[PDB]
Tab-separated table of C-alpha atoms and ligand atoms in Angstrom:
chain	number	residue	atom	x	y	z
A	1	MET	CA	-0.111	-0.015	0.262
A	2	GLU	CA	3.093	2.327	-0.362
A	3	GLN	CA	2.888	6.067	-0.423
A	4	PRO	CA	3.871	7.716	-3.643
A	5	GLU	CA	7.065	9.356	-3.485
A	6	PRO	CA	6.667	13.416	-3.411
A	7	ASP	CA	7.603	15.551	-6.402
A	8	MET	CA	7.546	18.628	-4.044
A	9	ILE	CA	7.871	19.428	-0.358
A	10	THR	CA	7.515	22.622	1.759
A	11	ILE	CA	10.399	23.854	3.883
A	12	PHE	CA	9.974	26.162	6.733
A	13	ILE	CA	13.134	28.287	7.597
A	14	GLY	CA	13.240	30.541	11.032
A	15	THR	CA	16.027	32.643	12.140
A	16	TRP	CA	15.679	34.383	15.605
A	17	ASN	CA	18.564	36.178	17.382
A	18	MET	CA	17.275	35.424	21.066
A	19	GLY	CA	19.188	38.158	22.822
A	20	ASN	CA	20.547	35.483	25.492
A	21	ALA	CA	16.894	35.395	26.760
A	22	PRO	CA	14.574	32.279	27.021
A	23	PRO	CA	11.710	32.230	24.987
A	24	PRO	CA	8.431	33.127	25.985
A	25	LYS	CA	5.730	30.184	26.708
A	26	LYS	CA	4.084	30.467	23.286
A	27	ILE	CA	6.012	30.819	19.767
A	28	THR	CA	3.593	28.967	17.466
A	29	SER	CA	3.158	32.329	15.401
A	30	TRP	CA	6.643	31.803	14.212
A	31	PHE	CA	6.049	28.223	12.649
A	32	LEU	CA	2.692	29.493	11.532
A	33	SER	CA	4.187	32.464	9.369
A	34	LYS	CA	1.937	35.010	11.089
A	35	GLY	CA	2.842	38.707	11.740
A	36	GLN	CA	4.097	41.295	9.232
A	37	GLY	CA	5.094	40.715	5.691
A	38	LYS	CA	4.200	37.757	3.326
A	39	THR	CA	2.336	35.829	5.719
A	40	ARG	CA	0.709	32.353	5.476
A	41	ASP	CA	-3.159	31.802	4.775
A	42	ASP	CA	-5.083	30.541	8.061
A	43	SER	CA	-6.392	27.719	6.166
A	44	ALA	CA	-2.883	26.144	6.004
A	45	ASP	CA	-2.496	26.451	9.847
A	46	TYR	CA	-2.867	22.518	10.382
A	47	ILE	CA	-1.020	21.281	7.408
A	48	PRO	CA	2.755	20.574	8.370
A	49	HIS	CA	5.554	21.703	6.370
A	50	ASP	CA	7.779	18.286	5.493
A	51	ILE	CA	10.945	19.954	6.956
A	52	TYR	CA	11.415	22.582	9.787
A	53	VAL	CA	15.045	24.358	10.006
A	54	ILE	CA	15.304	26.503	12.942
A	55	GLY	CA	18.256	28.780	13.085
A	56	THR	CA	18.999	30.769	16.410
A	57	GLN	CA	21.922	33.293	17.279
A	58	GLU	CA	22.615	34.289	21.131
A	59	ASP	CA	20.704	31.156	21.863
A	60	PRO	CA	20.843	30.588	26.040
A	61	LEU	CA	19.193	27.401	26.186
A	62	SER	CA	20.664	23.639	25.736
A	63	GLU	CA	20.076	21.705	22.861
A	64	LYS	CA	17.847	19.409	25.180
A	65	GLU	CA	15.674	22.636	26.383
A	66	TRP	CA	15.414	23.955	22.865
A	67	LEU	CA	14.299	20.563	20.979
A	68	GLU	CA	11.649	20.137	23.825
A	69	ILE	CA	10.057	23.362	23.186
A	70	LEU	CA	10.278	23.120	19.145
A	71	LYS	CA	8.843	19.765	19.207
A	72	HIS	CA	6.123	20.706	21.676
A	73	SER	CA	5.268	23.832	19.362
A	74	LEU	CA	4.962	21.793	16.209
A	75	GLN	CA	2.968	18.864	17.944
A	76	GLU	CA	0.408	21.706	19.185
A	77	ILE	CA	0.146	22.989	15.717
A	78	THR	CA	0.038	19.883	13.313
A	79	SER	CA	-0.793	17.041	16.091
A	80	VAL	CA	2.654	15.525	14.594
A	81	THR	CA	5.473	14.353	16.301
A	82	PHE	CA	8.584	15.646	14.551
A	83	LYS	CA	11.897	13.587	14.159
A	84	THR	CA	14.980	15.355	14.748
A	85	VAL	CA	17.031	14.967	11.676
A	86	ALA	CA	20.244	16.887	12.981
A	87	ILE	CA	21.141	19.477	15.572
A	88	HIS	CA	24.352	21.649	15.911
A	89	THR	CA	25.743	24.546	18.048
A	90	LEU	CA	28.717	26.688	17.843
A	91	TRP	CA	28.827	28.926	20.854
A	92	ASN	CA	25.467	30.333	20.799
A	93	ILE	CA	24.659	29.712	17.260
A	94	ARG	CA	22.396	26.732	16.342
A	95	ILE	CA	20.634	24.883	14.029
A	96	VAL	CA	17.769	22.405	14.205
A	97	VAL	CA	16.416	20.424	11.257
A	98	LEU	CA	12.946	18.508	12.232
A	99	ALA	CA	11.023	16.297	9.448
A	100	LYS	CA	7.935	14.542	9.399
A	101	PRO	CA	8.127	10.867	10.597
A	102	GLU	CA	7.248	9.672	7.216
A	103	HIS	CA	10.304	10.970	5.773
A	104	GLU	CA	12.787	9.333	8.066
A	105	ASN	CA	13.653	6.616	5.503
A	106	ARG	CA	13.788	9.441	2.714
A	107	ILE	CA	16.669	11.149	4.465
A	108	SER	CA	20.390	9.987	4.370
A	109	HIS	CA	23.809	11.382	4.228
A	110	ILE	CA	23.034	13.826	7.089
A	111	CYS	CA	26.151	16.121	7.806
A	112	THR	CA	26.743	18.874	10.498
A	113	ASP	CA	29.676	21.571	10.279
A	114	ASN	CA	30.715	24.967	11.716
A	115	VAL	CA	32.942	27.769	10.539
A	116	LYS	CA	34.549	30.500	13.315
A	117	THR	CA	35.130	33.546	11.544
A	118	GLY	CA	37.592	36.455	12.453
A	119	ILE	CA	41.283	36.261	13.936
A	120	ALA	CA	42.283	36.486	17.526
A	121	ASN	CA	40.079	39.368	18.879
A	122	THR	CA	37.231	38.675	16.284
A	123	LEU	CA	37.446	34.791	16.912
A	124	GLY	CA	35.258	33.714	19.495
A	125	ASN	CA	31.620	34.416	18.982
A	126	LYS	CA	30.559	35.039	15.249
A	127	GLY	CA	30.192	32.456	12.472
A	128	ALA	CA	28.105	29.756	11.172
A	129	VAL	CA	26.379	26.307	11.261
A	130	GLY	CA	24.918	24.094	8.902
A	131	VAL	CA	23.294	20.558	7.806
A	132	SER	CA	23.308	18.995	4.746
A	133	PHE	CA	21.439	15.718	3.700
A	134	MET	CA	19.902	13.817	0.777
A	135	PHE	CA	15.925	13.956	0.448
A	136	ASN	CA	15.353	10.902	-1.855
A	137	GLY	CA	17.329	12.079	-5.278
A	138	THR	CA	17.549	16.007	-3.961
A	139	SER	CA	20.483	17.505	-1.936
A	140	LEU	CA	19.494	19.989	0.425
A	141	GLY	CA	21.894	22.388	2.414
A	142	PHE	CA	20.999	24.732	5.419
A	143	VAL	CA	23.330	27.556	6.618
A	144	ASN	CA	22.601	29.571	10.025
A	145	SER	CA	25.220	32.517	10.109
A	146	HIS	CA	25.851	35.165	12.811
A	147	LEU	CA	27.909	37.831	11.070
A	148	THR	CA	30.035	40.580	12.371
A	149	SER	CA	27.821	43.471	13.996
A	150	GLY	CA	28.136	47.226	13.563
A	151	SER	CA	26.899	49.590	10.765
A	152	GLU	CA	30.384	50.405	9.811
A	153	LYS	CA	31.285	46.612	9.149
A	154	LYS	CA	29.766	45.639	6.062
A	155	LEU	CA	32.982	44.682	4.414
A	156	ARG	CA	33.767	42.274	7.410
A	157	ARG	CA	30.500	40.752	6.694
A	158	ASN	CA	31.181	40.043	3.332
A	159	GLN	CA	34.463	38.736	4.383
A	160	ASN	CA	32.760	36.551	6.913
A	161	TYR	CA	30.387	35.342	4.030
A	162	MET	CA	33.134	34.270	1.824
A	163	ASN	CA	34.879	32.209	4.713
A	164	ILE	CA	31.625	30.373	5.896
A	165	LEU	CA	31.363	29.531	2.242
A	166	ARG	CA	34.755	28.136	1.482
A	167	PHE	CA	35.429	26.328	4.617
A	168	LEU	CA	31.896	24.950	5.505
A	169	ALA	CA	32.245	20.909	4.645
A	170	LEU	CA	28.819	20.072	4.003
A	171	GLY	CA	27.355	17.848	1.029
A	172	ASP	CA	29.303	15.273	-1.143
A	173	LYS	CA	32.828	15.362	-0.252
A	174	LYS	CA	33.756	13.774	-3.881
A	175	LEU	CA	32.551	17.282	-5.322
A	176	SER	CA	35.877	18.337	-4.436
A	177	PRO	CA	36.309	21.399	-6.424
A	178	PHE	CA	32.888	22.809	-5.341
A	179	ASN	CA	31.964	24.775	-2.511
A	180	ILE	CA	28.543	24.951	-0.608
A	181	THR	CA	27.118	27.231	-3.204
A	182	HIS	CA	27.447	24.297	-5.874
A	183	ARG	CA	26.808	21.403	-3.732
A	184	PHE	CA	23.000	21.265	-3.273
A	185	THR	CA	19.948	21.093	-5.507
A	186	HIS	CA	18.413	23.857	-2.896
A	187	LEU	CA	20.595	25.639	-0.419
A	188	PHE	CA	19.266	27.978	2.185
A	189	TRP	CA	21.567	30.717	3.873
A	190	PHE	CA	19.722	32.352	6.790
A	191	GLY	CA	20.611	34.040	10.136
A	192	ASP	CA	21.473	37.306	11.975
A	193	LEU	CA	23.649	38.444	8.933
A	194	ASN	CA	23.815	41.938	10.680
A	195	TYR	CA	23.630	44.225	7.543
A	196	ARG	CA	22.064	47.545	8.298
A	197	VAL	CA	20.059	50.519	7.328
A	198	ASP	CA	23.001	53.203	5.944
A	199	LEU	CA	21.260	56.220	6.878
A	200	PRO	CA	22.550	59.051	9.309
A	201	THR	CA	22.197	58.735	12.917
A	202	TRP	CA	20.344	62.019	13.148
A	203	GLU	CA	17.788	60.571	10.997
A	204	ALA	CA	16.507	58.070	13.539
A	205	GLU	CA	13.259	59.677	14.404
A	206	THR	CA	12.550	59.929	10.605
A	207	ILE	CA	13.288	56.098	10.290
A	208	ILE	CA	10.975	55.279	12.980
A	209	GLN	CA	8.293	57.506	11.612
A	210	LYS	CA	8.800	55.705	8.432
A	211	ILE	CA	8.153	52.372	9.876
A	212	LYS	CA	5.087	53.526	11.821
A	213	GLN	CA	3.743	54.348	8.457
A	214	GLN	CA	4.606	51.113	6.855
A	215	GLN	CA	6.609	52.860	4.202
A	216	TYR	CA	9.516	50.893	3.815
A	217	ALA	CA	10.911	51.863	0.431
A	218	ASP	CA	13.642	54.663	1.277
A	219	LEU	CA	14.992	52.407	4.071
A	220	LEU	CA	15.134	49.357	1.820
A	221	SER	CA	17.213	51.512	-0.969
A	222	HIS	CA	19.873	51.852	2.021
A	223	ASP	CA	19.903	48.466	3.029
A	224	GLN	CA	23.386	47.100	2.847
A	225	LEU	CA	22.519	43.558	2.180
A	226	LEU	CA	20.547	44.700	-1.054
A	227	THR	CA	23.092	47.310	-1.959
A	228	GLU	CA	26.175	45.070	-1.619
A	229	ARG	CA	24.325	42.271	-3.352
A	230	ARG	CA	23.501	44.780	-6.275
A	231	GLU	CA	27.174	45.525	-6.473
A	232	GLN	CA	27.956	41.755	-6.721
A	233	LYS	CA	30.048	42.137	-3.271
A	234	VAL	CA	28.575	39.401	-1.325
A	235	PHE	CA	25.764	36.569	-1.985
A	236	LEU	CA	26.350	36.404	-5.679
A	237	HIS	CA	23.626	34.180	-7.426
A	238	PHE	CA	21.330	33.851	-4.351
A	239	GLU	CA	17.559	34.968	-4.073
A	240	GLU	CA	15.899	36.854	-1.532
A	241	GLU	CA	11.829	37.410	-1.343
A	242	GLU	CA	10.873	41.118	-1.261
A	243	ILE	CA	10.805	42.546	2.476
A	244	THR	CA	7.402	43.628	3.423
A	245	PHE	CA	7.840	43.494	7.014
A	246	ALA	CA	9.366	46.210	9.408
A	247	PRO	CA	12.989	45.969	10.452
A	248	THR	CA	13.468	43.167	13.029
A	249	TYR	CA	16.129	44.925	15.026
A	250	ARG	CA	16.999	46.656	17.606
A	251	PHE	CA	13.677	46.598	19.826
A	252	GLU	CA	13.173	47.118	23.474
A	253	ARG	CA	12.311	43.954	25.193
A	254	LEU	CA	8.639	42.962	26.299
A	255	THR	CA	7.223	45.402	23.637
A	256	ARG	CA	7.465	45.746	19.873
A	257	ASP	CA	6.327	49.454	20.122
A	258	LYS	CA	9.933	51.053	20.498
A	259	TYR	CA	13.223	50.711	18.467
A	260	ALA	CA	16.057	51.049	20.911
A	261	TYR	CA	18.879	52.928	18.583
A	262	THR	CA	20.380	55.052	20.938
A	263	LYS	CA	24.266	54.484	21.768
A	264	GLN	CA	24.696	52.957	25.255
A	265	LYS	CA	28.055	51.653	27.189
A	266	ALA	CA	26.198	48.031	26.626
A	267	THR	CA	26.433	48.627	22.748
A	268	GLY	CA	29.976	49.892	22.849
A	269	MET	CA	28.575	53.564	22.325
A	270	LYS	CA	27.138	52.387	19.126
A	271	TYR	CA	23.974	53.340	17.394
A	272	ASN	CA	21.580	50.789	16.168
A	273	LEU	CA	19.324	52.310	13.621
A	274	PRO	CA	16.380	49.996	12.979
A	275	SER	CA	17.766	47.430	10.364
A	276	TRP	CA	17.007	44.165	8.802
A	277	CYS	CA	19.278	42.163	10.598
A	278	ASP	CA	17.554	38.910	10.192
A	279	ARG	CA	17.408	37.285	6.707
A	280	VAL	CA	16.696	34.398	4.781
A	281	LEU	CA	18.007	33.738	1.084
A	282	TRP	CA	18.442	30.854	-1.162
A	283	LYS	CA	20.165	29.417	-4.116
A	284	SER	CA	18.863	26.495	-6.473
A	285	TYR	CA	20.226	24.755	-9.284
A	286	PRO	CA	18.892	25.940	-12.635
A	287	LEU	CA	15.293	25.117	-13.736
A	288	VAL	CA	14.435	23.510	-10.393
A	289	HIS	CA	11.309	24.566	-8.929
A	290	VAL	CA	11.412	26.810	-5.787
A	291	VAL	CA	8.752	29.360	-4.791
A	292	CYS	CA	8.832	31.414	-1.712
A	293	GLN	CA	5.362	30.975	0.013
A	294	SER	CA	6.181	33.223	3.109
A	295	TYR	CA	8.978	35.845	4.204
A	296	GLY	CA	7.832	38.067	7.399
A	297	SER	CA	8.437	38.388	11.148
A	298	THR	CA	6.506	37.668	14.230
A	299	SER	CA	4.852	40.463	16.234
A	300	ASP	CA	3.772	38.582	19.315
A	301	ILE	CA	7.336	37.274	20.511
A	302	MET	CA	8.823	39.807	22.505
A	303	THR	CA	11.781	38.571	24.625
A	304	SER	CA	14.583	39.555	22.412
A	305	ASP	CA	15.754	42.771	20.959
A	306	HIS	CA	15.216	40.691	17.653
A	307	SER	CA	11.748	39.608	16.085
A	308	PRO	CA	11.837	36.340	14.596
A	309	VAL	CA	11.722	35.752	10.694
A	310	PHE	CA	10.251	33.022	9.008
A	311	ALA	CA	10.184	31.985	5.390
A	312	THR	CA	8.463	29.171	3.565
A	313	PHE	CA	9.430	27.456	0.444
A	314	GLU	CA	7.776	25.073	-2.214
A	315	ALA	CA	10.821	22.890	-3.505
A	316	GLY	CA	11.025	20.489	-5.971
A	317	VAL	CA	12.418	17.129	-5.085
A	318	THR	CA	13.179	13.778	-7.441
A	319	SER	CA	12.838	10.248	-6.517
A	320	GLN	CA	15.664	7.648	-6.144
A	321	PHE	CA	15.493	6.024	-9.723
A	322	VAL	CA	16.492	2.370	-10.049
A	323	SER	CA	16.404	0.710	-13.626
A	324	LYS	CA	17.547	-2.696	-14.930
A	325	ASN	CA	20.920	-0.939	-15.888
A	326	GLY	CA	22.256	1.811	-13.469
A	327	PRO	CA	22.979	2.169	-10.632
A	328	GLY	CA	25.833	-0.333	-11.126
A	329	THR	CA	26.289	0.505	-14.608
A	330	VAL	CA	25.794	2.782	-17.464
A	331	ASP	CA	22.543	2.564	-19.733
A	332	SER	CA	23.940	3.007	-23.437
A	333	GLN	CA	20.801	4.662	-24.672
A	334	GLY	CA	21.897	7.817	-22.874
A	335	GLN	CA	24.546	10.167	-23.810
A	336	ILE	CA	25.247	13.822	-23.240
A	337	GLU	CA	27.582	15.687	-25.711
A	338	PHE	CA	29.074	19.512	-25.581
A	339	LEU	CA	29.432	21.084	-28.795
A	340	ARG	CA	31.389	24.429	-29.573
A	341	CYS	CA	32.229	25.010	-25.898
A	342	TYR	CA	34.332	27.764	-24.459
A	343	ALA	CA	35.355	29.273	-21.311
A	344	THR	CA	36.092	32.876	-20.871
A	345	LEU	CA	38.171	33.672	-17.828
A	346	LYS	CA	39.084	36.874	-15.981
A	347	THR	CA	42.573	35.699	-15.033
A	348	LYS	CA	46.054	36.822	-16.011
A	349	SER	CA	47.387	33.153	-15.696
A	350	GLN	CA	48.909	31.415	-18.739
A	351	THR	CA	48.568	27.628	-17.559
A	352	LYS	CA	46.629	25.528	-19.748
A	353	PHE	CA	43.175	24.348	-18.696
A	354	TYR	CA	40.951	21.236	-18.532
A	355	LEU	CA	37.323	20.601	-17.354
A	356	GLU	CA	35.861	18.202	-14.900
A	357	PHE	CA	31.900	17.102	-15.198
A	358	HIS	CA	30.555	16.051	-12.116
A	359	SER	CA	27.102	14.766	-11.551
A	360	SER	CA	24.988	12.002	-9.797
A	361	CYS	CA	24.019	10.900	-13.109
A	362	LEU	CA	27.649	9.780	-13.903
A	363	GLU	CA	29.360	6.608	-11.990
A	364	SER	CA	32.135	9.272	-11.336
A	365	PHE	CA	33.660	12.467	-12.614
A	366	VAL	CA	35.013	12.861	-16.002
A	367	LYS	CA	38.139	14.767	-16.946
A	368	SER	CA	38.246	16.552	-20.329
A	369	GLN	CA	41.497	17.169	-22.417
A	370	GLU	CA	43.332	20.757	-22.191
A	371	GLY	CA	41.701	23.469	-24.235
A	372	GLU	CA	43.034	25.890	-26.576
A	373	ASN	CA	43.830	29.079	-25.385
A	374	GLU	CA	43.014	32.176	-27.113
A	375	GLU	CA	43.060	35.910	-26.208
A	376	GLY	CA	39.668	37.636	-26.557
A	377	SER	CA	39.470	41.106	-28.040
A	378	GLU	CA	38.917	42.978	-24.589
A	379	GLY	CA	42.131	41.392	-23.100
A	380	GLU	CA	40.376	38.078	-21.674
A	381	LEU	CA	41.429	34.636	-21.473
A	382	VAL	CA	39.246	32.412	-24.028
A	383	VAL	CA	39.934	28.389	-23.592
A	384	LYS	CA	38.288	26.861	-26.510
A	385	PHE	CA	37.247	23.195	-26.007
A	386	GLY	CA	35.833	22.661	-29.784
A	387	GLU	CA	34.076	19.192	-30.161
A	388	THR	CA	37.044	17.626	-28.305
A	389	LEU	CA	34.727	17.413	-25.047
A	390	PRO	CA	34.372	13.747	-23.900
A	391	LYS	CA	30.674	12.236	-24.407
A	392	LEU	CA	29.263	11.881	-20.880
A	393	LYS	CA	27.751	8.364	-20.372
A	394	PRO	CA	24.645	8.660	-17.719
A	395	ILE	CA	23.888	5.750	-15.625
A	396	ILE	CA	20.088	5.839	-16.333
A	397	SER	CA	18.708	6.899	-19.794
A	398	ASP	CA	15.058	7.262	-18.821
A	399	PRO	CA	13.947	10.921	-19.685
A	400	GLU	CA	11.986	11.368	-16.717
A	401	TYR	CA	15.460	10.873	-14.793
A	402	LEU	CA	17.653	12.511	-17.157
A	403	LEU	CA	16.063	15.685	-17.932
A	404	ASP	CA	15.817	16.435	-14.023
A	405	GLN	CA	19.582	16.215	-13.524
A	406	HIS	CA	22.287	18.721	-13.532
A	407	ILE	CA	26.143	18.869	-14.350
A	408	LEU	CA	28.595	20.631	-12.207
A	409	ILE	CA	31.623	22.147	-14.476
A	410	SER	CA	34.928	22.946	-12.881
A	411	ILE	CA	38.030	24.555	-15.059
A	412	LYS	CA	41.196	23.535	-13.484
A	413	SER	CA	44.783	24.726	-14.033
A	414	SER	CA	46.925	21.904	-15.590
A	415	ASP	CA	49.726	23.089	-13.632
A	416	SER	CA	48.338	23.358	-10.100
A	417	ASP	CA	45.088	21.186	-10.433
A	418	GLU	CA	43.132	24.183	-8.883
A	419	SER	CA	39.701	25.235	-9.756
A	420	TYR	CA	39.667	28.784	-11.438
A	421	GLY	CA	35.777	28.570	-11.935
A	422	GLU	CA	32.715	26.320	-11.100
A	423	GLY	CA	29.356	26.441	-12.548
A	424	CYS	CA	26.490	24.202	-13.184
A	425	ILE	CA	24.067	23.356	-16.407
A	426	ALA	CA	20.786	21.981	-16.160
A	427	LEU	CA	19.599	18.983	-18.617
A	428	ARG	CA	15.864	20.297	-18.433
A	429	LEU	CA	16.204	20.880	-21.937
A	430	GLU	CA	13.656	22.204	-24.713
A	431	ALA	CA	14.564	19.424	-27.100
A	432	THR	CA	16.436	15.958	-26.916
A	433	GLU	CA	18.482	14.885	-29.866
A	434	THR	CA	18.708	18.667	-30.667
A	435	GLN	CA	21.776	21.160	-30.278
A	436	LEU	CA	20.820	23.676	-27.976
A	437	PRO	CA	22.511	26.667	-26.280
A	438	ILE	CA	24.181	26.303	-22.590
A	439	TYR	CA	25.435	28.871	-20.364
A	440	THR	CA	26.593	29.113	-16.776
A	441	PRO	CA	28.559	31.858	-14.992
A	442	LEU	CA	31.797	30.707	-13.363
A	443	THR	CA	32.628	31.482	-9.549
A	444	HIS	CA	35.497	30.587	-7.536
A	445	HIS	CA	35.393	31.454	-3.788
A	446	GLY	CA	31.735	32.555	-4.499
A	447	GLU	CA	33.097	35.506	-6.812
A	448	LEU	CA	32.632	35.433	-10.649
A	449	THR	CA	35.540	34.553	-12.421
A	450	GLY	CA	34.467	33.821	-15.954
A	451	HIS	CA	31.813	31.855	-18.020
A	452	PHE	CA	31.093	28.490	-19.954
A	453	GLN	CA	29.049	28.436	-22.798
A	454	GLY	CA	28.584	26.398	-26.027
A	455	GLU	CA	25.889	23.930	-27.122
A	456	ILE	CA	24.489	20.548	-25.668
A	457	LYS	CA	22.920	17.525	-27.392
A	458	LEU	CA	21.204	15.038	-24.827
A	459	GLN	CA	20.281	11.482	-25.994
A	460	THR	CA	17.802	9.841	-23.754
A	461	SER	CA	15.921	6.241	-24.163
A	462	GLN	CA	12.988	8.442	-25.908
B	1	YBP	C1	29.144	15.514	5.028
B	1	YBP	C2	29.911	14.962	4.211
B	1	YBP	C3	29.440	14.075	3.078
B	1	YBP	O1	30.592	13.485	2.018
B	1	YBP	N1	28.252	13.786	2.907
B	1	YBP	C4	27.550	13.593	1.762
B	1	YBP	C5	28.139	12.263	1.019
B	1	YBP	C6	27.558	11.938	0.004
B	1	YBP	C7	26.305	12.767	-0.422
B	1	YBP	C8	25.556	12.320	-1.641
B	1	YBP	C9	24.607	13.220	-1.997
B	1	YBP	C10	24.008	14.168	-1.447
B	1	YBP	C11	24.663	14.750	-0.273
B	1	YBP	CL1	24.141	15.923	0.661
B	1	YBP	C12	25.818	13.809	0.163
B	1	YBP	N2	26.505	14.299	1.525
């Protein structure tokens, strides 16, 4: 009588800087996506999300204490006893992953890790925790980061981001050229990112007035995370839902009627103008379904100087496919061919380069011959592969499997074997047996290093 495997799941993401205070007795509004912003319909209150991922900062509770509160809260809402997938804490930064009991046998390869940011003085409370796992055929990653505080420290926040994405060891370790920004079908990155509204301190009361009027436009135009992202300084190739809720920091505790922005000994004589510190971003592989269903803040949880933030997503997932052939052999009906491909690189290096193709649809990664270096008009390096690239042999040829897969590409130096650029190509093509354009930007350490473009021709069993 087996339940069919899902094609889509819903995921709840929560971030809350708890301000080193215990929570109030009731926090269900958080998990219901109720308050300000893009909120969830009342008619969905009893429908459980498939996965709940809860990130805290300045969390004063034990793992045991917080798990008990979380599981009781979800049982009250849904009448379901959720299973603990993973819990990991670095200092007072914590991530909890809970899942419906029906998903226990769909989840495998659970990993946790942390990154400590800063050196000496700036090492010891900021960094990130994360969790990854497989959900049937779909790889999921989750990062909760508490970045450097202070309105004048946006560059340090951007440096913290680059250290976390380089050093957090999640996902398939065989994907050696790839950082967490390429290892997952869906990656969610959330936390107290600590970016501020960059307006003069003497405009504090003006800002509060704007908030009371629910007029966020002239504040969001100065939000450091939106401006740094627009300038490609941080979170390149991530998405965020439009913000339609009030700044979530810095509140007087025990009400939400008052923003506490003035400099005090307790703040290091820093101002904390109202800001959207608490954020949820994501990055999914090309042409995979991901839709943000909610993004908002609670109004009734007041123990911290931050309000909790929620976001919910409908995310596409795939099945664990088994044919008569693969896994454990190739299906010769299938092939992936790359035609007239070239990489354009920002590097000044004059080494030869080769490609590596990594995918779950291959028995193991494939290494190309070296390309032929030319100079582009505007000074650049162009690495030409012609029709020289290997024919990739997928393990399963069924189009219902193969059209849902992705090929990770690394371009590596022949001299050093180091990646100069990583990217991802979807096989969700408009046509099979047809030459079609392909394209990915290439990044390294999450910054743009080039592009890969050319044509693909996909052979399936149909
Ligand atoms: C966390 C260490 C590790 O290697 N995890 C791992 C291994 C294999 C995987 C396959 C597919 C998806 C994921 Cl998330 C995997 N993670």
